[PDB]
Structure 1
């Protein structure tokens, strides 16, 4: 068929600049944060387990 529509959507998306964030830790420090966040620091729950990235 017609090949004139190649790249249609990617060239239609409005450009959005990435924001500036503080650099992430690496190596042992990242694993220390994950360990402290998943097991050391826990809040009481009523059985409705939520995922790390739950929203609404």
Structure 2
């Protein structure tokens, strides 16, 4: 087979820079953040609990 198309999609993928965002806490602070986010202010939609709801 022809080898001329190697890296075609990655080469032609439009470059997008990573948006600058505040650092996330590390260690115990991060475990605390997940704990509150999942057991303190529960955001369940009456029995429907999703970690990563896509925007819709």
Q: TM-score band, normalised by the shorter chain? A: 0.7 to 0.9
Give structure 1 stretches of 5+ with no counterpart. none
Q: If each structure's helix is expressed as a fraction of its own residues, which one has the higher value?
A: 2
- Show the counterpart of 2:52: 53
TM-score by length of 1: 0.84
Q: Secondary structure at the match of 2:6?
A: coil
Partner of 2:8: 8
RMSD: 1.5
Consecutive aligned runs of 4 or more in structure 1 exceeding 4 Å deviation: none
Task: Indicate the SS of the match to 1:24.
Answer: coil
Aligned length: 55
Q: Which runs of 5+ in 2 are unaligned?
A: none
- Deviation, 1:50, is 3.3
In structure 2, distance between residues paired with 1:19 and 1:44? 29
